[PDB]
Write a protein that binds this ligand. Structure first.
Ligand SMILES: [Fe+3]
Ligand SMILES: [Fe+3]
Ligand SMILES: [Fe+3]
Ligand SMILES: [Fe+3]
Ligand SMILES: [Zn+2]
Ligand SMILES: [Zn+2]
Lengths: 191, 191
């Protein structure tokens, strides 16, 4: 790694920075619509994904040493729909990104002598693959009615107050904090 | 349920509100010390628990219809230590609460004709039991060196950027966002 200035990798980094910046915003707006649709756990994962996009953008932006730079590129023009649709559009763009755009960008960085940047573009691809995965399972539970209803009794946690509930479905109201079903999630352990 | 004024349940609600308010603060301070100790996932669970305490306090506070009211009660006087110790003090107080204090308070509410409040005190007890559980497993992994090291290869997620890593231990540095190991957690699915 030399200088980036004038290289193709230089425009590739700005282009990625540009689509990741917009993605932060759309995930943030999709999070607010999810909360409105009554899926608090899905709202918080949009917001988490938003924040992780900010951090992919920041590692990238830091490679730039430049001034003003012109790019040609395509981006979704809209749109905010119902949550299911939001989760499908998101997944589709995460898809294009880990299967198409970052493999290429990594290739050329590599090919221009920037292998570290190449690493970074490959590592981000990994993250976008989990993001898509997440978005697809949530969209499938929405499509199959299993957000707030499972087939054998399991335990549900209140995101708002931590209340735990043994049942096949979450309660219509939290007995502890009196927030509605929308606040409930599958209880999970990850330690 | 009548009026609460003058009842014993009346002082019980304020006393619980008082210990839960302080608990919010101590969990918030324990979260900052955890971040300093290099346990980001544990930092965020302190902060989450803090927020759930706020919401137990709020359901309670809303039952009050009163003016100024005198209480006698004991509270921890201090202290902020290392994270392990923080997790053990927290668990001990969560313990006293679900095994002793809220069972009683629920009893008397019940016994004074306030069964709904009684429910609420029982439902909060449930939440505090999961909180303790959480705190104990994290303190055990800290004691056994398994926060950031497992015995068979498993996958670790970067909290900062979503990067996923297959291995027995988390990386020393995230390849995607270049944040240190402290940001990694066991990857979990709960949908
Ligand atoms: Fe992504
Ligand atoms: Fe609740
Ligand atoms: Fe608690
Ligand atoms: Fe990372
Ligand atoms: Zn990204
Ligand atoms: Zn509480």
């Amino acid at each position: 790694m030399k200088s980036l200035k004038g290289s193709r990798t230089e425009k590739n980094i700005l282009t990625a920075f540009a689509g990741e910046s917009q993605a932060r915003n759309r995930y943030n707006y999709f999070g607010g619509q999810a909360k409105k649709d009554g899926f608090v756990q899905i709202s918080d994962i949009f917001a988490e994904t938003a924040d992780q996009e900010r951090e992919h953008a920041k590692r990238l932006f830091k490679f730039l040493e430049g001034g003003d730079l012109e790019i040609v590129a395509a981006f979704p023009a809209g749109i905010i729909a119902d949550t299911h649709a939001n989760l499908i559009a998101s997944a589709a763009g995460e898809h294009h990104e880990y299967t198409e755009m970052y493999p290429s960008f990594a290739r050329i960085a590599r090919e221009e002598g920037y292998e570290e940047i190449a690493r970074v573009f490959a590592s981000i691809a990994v993250a976008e693959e989990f993001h898509e995965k997440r978005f697809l399972d949530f969209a499938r539970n929405i499509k199959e009615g299993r957000v707030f209803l499972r087939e054998q009794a399991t335990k549900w946690r209140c995101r708002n107050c931590g209340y735990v509930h043994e049942g096949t479905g979450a309660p219509e109201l939290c007995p502890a904090c009196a927030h509605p079903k929308a606040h409930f999630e599958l209880l999970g352990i990850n330690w």
